[PDB]
Design a protein around this ligand. Structure first.
Ligand SMILES: Nc1ccn([C@H]2C[C@H](O)[C@@H](COP(=O)(O)OP(=O)(O)OP(=O)(O)O)O2)c(=O)n1
Ligand SMILES: [Ca+2]
Ligand SMILES: [Ca+2]
Ligand SMILES: [Ca+2]
Length: 902
DNA sequence: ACGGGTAAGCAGTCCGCG
DNA sequence: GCGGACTGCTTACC
């Protein structure tokens, strides 16, 4: 037996015992109960010397505890006295650290990941899990070990009796009277019909004991499915039987009970719930107009809506065959989405790295508390007691005020992982604080005028001095996560570059039948592959393109989420629930960044005045925290439309000017700033990102800024990737906002593409056609979106109260128009909503209306709102005002002037 | 309780203004 | 009868 080391699955604390589920050395799943004996520490005199020193070198003495409750009355007793009680007071983590004293290398094929969704017919409307009034009438449950979809289908219920489900009919196309259940899963569905609900649940509980999930997921499974099936079994069989959903027989019900409802969260000891919706909100870097599975599915996977007739509420009685097919597809849908985004994998990686419960990957603070503590166990150090602190504003990034205008030629540069780098460069840590110095005003450091803070320590322009010689835990531990990011980024950019090869190739689609190639898209297509691609068919290239984008999304996920974590350690230092919170360090970081950016603004202005020849002229037109945006018009003039054959030539050129002259200069400038602050290590690595301009010989303006955080740019090269066709990089404007209607986002963007690529005549032409045709766009397409908070607070007898938002006012008028009948869907406090304006003297008695997003409005009122919609207002408010924004800034009109020729 | 600050633009109210 | 300054709210950007 020359083989693998054990690895935990879950862990819990009940009283004076730890409940752990793990995978042993022969790969079998197990449970133990352990009366863990923890150790906390206390200071002692300089003399009682030993192993343990706090992070400041103050000696400490370790204390046996008999059990965990015994060590907790000690932490309370030490506060009753008023001395610091050191050590890790979350014992699940100490236990994990004690048991798994090594880099955990873990096998996912051995971890049970279950994915489920239920269906619960209600003619009452939305079925609150806290009550669970209504029968659970279908469950689908996918198990990653077995690799099967277990279907529990209830044929008999007070809401209707139905025929068994046919897997043959599910397989067939929609077009053949079937449900289009993906055939790569037909062979994996185990189907189980049932007499009656009781019999189905009892069988589901027995199924769960045999195949108890470790990671439990699915869509919206924390706030609906789990608590509904808990409360349901609890109402029908009793708590005892309900507690079966826990492998340890412990649940918690914490009440948190709306402004008037009964929403509880239910925790199942010994299971790690990773609600995919929470994973998606945290790790996907999107902001969506709706978070229904239909919606997100169609966004991530480009699959269809998933249609049907009648309202979902009467669906099981009318087409039970589809009701079940749809439940199965929903579960698979989440799998399809996880196969793209890979957030489960992320979570496992991250979680086993820190040695935490996996559901603690939602908490950067947990995540770092544990990494840091593991890193300090190692050197026999003892961690601080966490302290109460009052909350406190403090300053962040600098942002240059730009002159609103157009900018023909732009070229950007940005610093690598800024704040993480600053920590590394400066050696910022709880335990590396040397002292302070007398701080001169910020600009004196920017202008390289103020006295050198210190000769011996590493400094930040907020007055902090750090030990330059030793190693900080934080810097150390952030360097390890940064190095993993570097690598996954590499794969992702490669993947992106490889995709542009493929897109170029798609104007030579070679009339032929082939299969796609066999390459590893994380690495730069070696020349022989590149030559092979030039001969392939569309069918084939297209399959490679799609495979590349899945490889790149994979890498994006891994990369941007380590960026998230490290930037989140920075954040934690400004958050009072973090054991190492310190505004001294938070501000050392932001203030140094303020300086860094401004310092290099001054520099880049200097160098480009020297070499361009001119003097005291603005070359940096904008910048945000780590960014600079340099006007390259004068670098181009220096040649002209002389020997530039095509759009690519000057792009080749600039790429070359930046890489061969500017980044050398920039490195010189920052090396000098590091000498000034006497930092530990030079890590201000500013390289080039974007390269933007009109196509050659165009009327296109290349770029514009309206104000801070609001610009567009027509970009030909980004971080080394040369685009096949130019890509708009729009930051801040209305095209990028989830609040603005899809159709206008589309339109506003095509307008921008025209301003930037095909001057003023192109815009005005297209604008004319948007104005005429705008009125027959589908209403869902031209509605606004808003989050819906504090509805209750602005109610006041069915009507708008003092200071009531337009969108909240919208819901109130919905609530008035569906008043009475429970048939129609309710707007949920906190969710999102569509929003249309209404004309003068409409039947709804108000100037707009709102319904919950991702849906068609109720049929009840649909035909009325469609005919009372105010397109006039729609277009002025959401298209025109924004457009005037963009064109004012860039010195342009969208409508032909009063010619004076006339 | 459970990463951070910065900043834009929309709408509502309350006030000055022949 | 309406514009601007202030404020609450939403959603972007690092
Ligand atoms: N959610 C975020 C995003 C950014 N930032 C801060 C920390 C970043 O270091 C700094 C610069 O932002 P960037 O968006 O340019 O990201 P980075 O510089 O960290 O990494 P990179 O540009 O290599 O992707 O802004 C942050 O604190 N939190
Ligand atoms: Ca950066
Ligand atoms: Ca940046
Ligand atoms: Ca970069």
């Amino acid at each position: 037996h020359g083989s693998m080391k054990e690895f935990y699955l879950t862990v819990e604390q009940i009283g004076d015992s730890i409940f752990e589920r793990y995978i042993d050395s022969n790969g079998r799943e197990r449970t133990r109960e352990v009366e863990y004996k923890p150790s906390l520490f206390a200071h002692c005199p300089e003399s009682q010397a030993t192993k343990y020193f706090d992070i400041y070198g103050k000696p400490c003495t370790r204390k046996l505890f008999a059990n965990m409750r015994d060590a907790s009355q000690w932490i309370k007793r030490m506060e009753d006295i008023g001395l610091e009680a050191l050590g890790m007071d979350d014992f699940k983590l100490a236990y994990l650290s004690d048991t798994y004293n090594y880099e955990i290398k873990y096998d996912h094929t051995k971890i049970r990941v279950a994915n489920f969704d239920i269906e619960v017919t209600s003619p009452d409307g939305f079925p609150e899990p806290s009550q669970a009034k209504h029968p659970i009438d279908a469950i689908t449950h996918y198990d990653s070990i077995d690799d099967r979809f277990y279907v529990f289908d209830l044929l008999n219920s007070p809401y209707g009796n139905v025929e068994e489900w046919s897997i043959e009919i599910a397989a067939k196309l929609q077009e053949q009277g079937g449900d289009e259940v993906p055939s790569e899963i037909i062979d994996k569905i185990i189907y189980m019909p049932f007499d009656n609900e009781k019999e189905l649940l009892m069988e589901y509980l027995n199924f769960w004991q045999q195949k108890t999930p470790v990671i439990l997921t699915g869509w919206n499974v924390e706030s609906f499915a789990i608590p509904y099936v808990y409360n349901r079994i609890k109402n029908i069989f009793g708590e005892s039987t309900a507690k079966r959903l826990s492998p340890h027989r412990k649940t918690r019900v914490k009440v948190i009970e709306n402004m008037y409802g009964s929403r509880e969260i239910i925790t199942l000891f010994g299971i790690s719930v990773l609600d995919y919706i929470d994973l998606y909100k945290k790790f996907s870097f999107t902001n969506q107009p709706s978070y229904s599975l239909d919606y997100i599915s169609e966004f991530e996977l480009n699959v269809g809506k998933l249609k049907y007739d009648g309202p979902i509420s009467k669906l099981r009685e009318s087409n039970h065959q589809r009701y079940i097919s749809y439940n199965i597809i929903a579960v698979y849908r989440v799998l399809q989405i996880d196969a793209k985004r890979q957030f489960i994998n992320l979570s496992l990686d991250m979680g086993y790295y820190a040695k935490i419960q996996i559901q603690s990957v939602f908490s950067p603070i947990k995540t770092w508390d544990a990494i840091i503590f593991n890193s300090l166990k190692e050197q026999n150090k003892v961690i601080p007691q966490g302290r109460s602190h009052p909350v406190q504003p403090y300053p962040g990034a600098f942002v240059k005020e730009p002159i609103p205008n157009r900018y023909k030629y732009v070229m950007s540069f940005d610093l690598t992982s800024l704040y993480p780098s600053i920590i590394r460069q400066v050696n910022i840590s709880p335990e590396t604080i040397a002292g302070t110095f007398k701080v001169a005003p910020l600009h004196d450091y920017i202008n390289a005028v103020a006295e050198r803070p210190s000769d011996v320590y590493s400094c930040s322009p907020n007055g902090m001095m750090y030990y330059k010689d030793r190693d900080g835990v934080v810097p150390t531990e952030i360097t390890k996560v940064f190095n993993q990011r570097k690598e996954h980024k590499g794969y992702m950019l490669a993947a992106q570059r490889n995709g542009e090869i493929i897109k170029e190739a798609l104007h030579n689609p070679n009339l032929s039948v082939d299969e796609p190639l066999d390459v590893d898209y994380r690495f730069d297509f070696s020349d022989e592959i590149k030559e092979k691609i030039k001969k392939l068919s569309a069918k084939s290239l297209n399959e490679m393109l799609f495979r590349a984008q899945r490889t790149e999304v994979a890498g994006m996920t891994a990369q941007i989420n380590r960026k998230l974590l490290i930037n989140s350690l920075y954040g934690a230092l400004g958050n009072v629930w973090f054991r190492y919170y310190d505004l001294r360090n938070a501000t050392a970081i932001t203030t140094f960044g303020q300086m860094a950016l401004q310092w290099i603004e001054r520099k880049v202005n200097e160098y480009l005045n020297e070499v361009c020849g001119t003097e005291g002229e603005a070359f940096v037109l904008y910048g945000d925290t780590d960014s600079i945006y340099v006007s390259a018009d004068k670098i181009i003039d220096k040649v002209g439309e002389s020997k530039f054959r095509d759009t690519n030539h000057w792009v080749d050129f600039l790429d070359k000017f930046a890489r061969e002259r500017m980044e050398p200069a920039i490195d010189r400038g920052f090396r000098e700033m590091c000498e000034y602050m006497n930092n530990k290590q030079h890590l201000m690595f500013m390289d080039r990102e974007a390269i933007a301009g009109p196509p050659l010989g165009s009327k296109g303006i290349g770029g514009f800024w309206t104000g801070k955080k609001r610009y567009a740019l027509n970009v030909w090269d980004m971080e080394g990737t040369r685009y096949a066709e130019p890509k708009l990089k729009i930051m801040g404007l209305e095209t990028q906002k989830s609040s603005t209607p899809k159709a206008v986002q589309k339109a506003l963007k095509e307008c921008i593409r025209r301003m930037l690529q095909e001057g003023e005549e192109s815009l005005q032409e297209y604008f004319k056609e948007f104005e005429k045709e705008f009125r027959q766009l589908n209403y869902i397409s031209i509605a606004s979106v808003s989050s819906a908070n504090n509805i209750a607070k602005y109610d006041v007898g069915g009507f708008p109260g003092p200071k009531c938002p337009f969108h909240i006012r919208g819901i109130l008028t919905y609530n008035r128009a569906i008043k009475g009948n429970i048939d129609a869907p309710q707007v949920v406090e906190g969710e999102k909503v569509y929003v249309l304006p209404l004309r003068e003297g409409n039947p709804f008695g108000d100037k707009c209306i709102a319904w919950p997003s991702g849906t068609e409005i109720t049929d009840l009122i649909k035909d009325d709102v469609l005919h009372w919609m105010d397109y006039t207002v729609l277009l002025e408010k959401t298209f025109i005002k924004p457009l005037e924004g963009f064109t004012s800034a860039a010195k342009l009109d969208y409508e032909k002037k009063a010619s004076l020729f006339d």
